[PDB]
């Protein structure tokens, strides 16, 4: 199965390079990659680099993560905030590793996936699913 993974990847990549899409799960992944790049840009110019702002005390990464996320969606959910959610998680994985804390990377992924499933998914379903997100971020 590892060999087919390599083939579906790359093919997705080469199709995307020509404005095409392997599947529109792959277009979601693509659109979200681009959105994160633009978000991390307009966040940088308006304030500081998101990753530099991160300073994780040892054994407080979960609390740090849950605090920002719970505050981000305190009063509501929207696509632009979900983008912020991914970028912040990405910045946290990059801020980890930098400080030789690679163990956190898998844990962060679990925190993100869990929060996405339980708390954000219901909103996503009512607002036309991830397919809608791609239309707005073409």
């Amino acid at each position: 199965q590892s060999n087919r993974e390599l083939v579906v990847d790359f093919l997705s990549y080469k199709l995307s390079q020509k404005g095409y899409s392997w599947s529109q799960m792959a277009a979601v992944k693509q659109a979200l990659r681009e959105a994160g790049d633009e978000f991390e840009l307009r966040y940088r110019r308006a304030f500081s680099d998101l990753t530099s702002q991160l300073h994780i005390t040892p054994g407080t990464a979960y609390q740090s993560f849950e605090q920002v996320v719970n505050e981000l969606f305190r009063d509501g959910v929207n696509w632009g905030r979900i983008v912020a959610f991914f970028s912040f998680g990405g910045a946290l994985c990059v801020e980890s590793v930098d400080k030789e804390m690679q163990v956190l990377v898998s844990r962060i992924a679990a925190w993100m996936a869990t929060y996405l499933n339980d708390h954000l998914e219901p909103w996503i379903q009512e607002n036309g699913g991830w397919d809608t997100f791609v239309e707005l971020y073409g």
């Binding site: 959105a35 978000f39 307009r42 966040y43 308006a46 304030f47 998101l50 702002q53 991160l54 605090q67 920002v68 505050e71 981000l72 929207n78 696509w79 632009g80 905030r81 983008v83 912020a84 970028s87 912040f88 707005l136 971020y137």
Partner: peptide, 16 residues
Amino acid sequence: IAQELRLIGDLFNAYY
């Protein structure tokens, strides 16, 4: 960080 993310987040959403 939380307020800042909410800002660009909300600016993105209102943009489209």
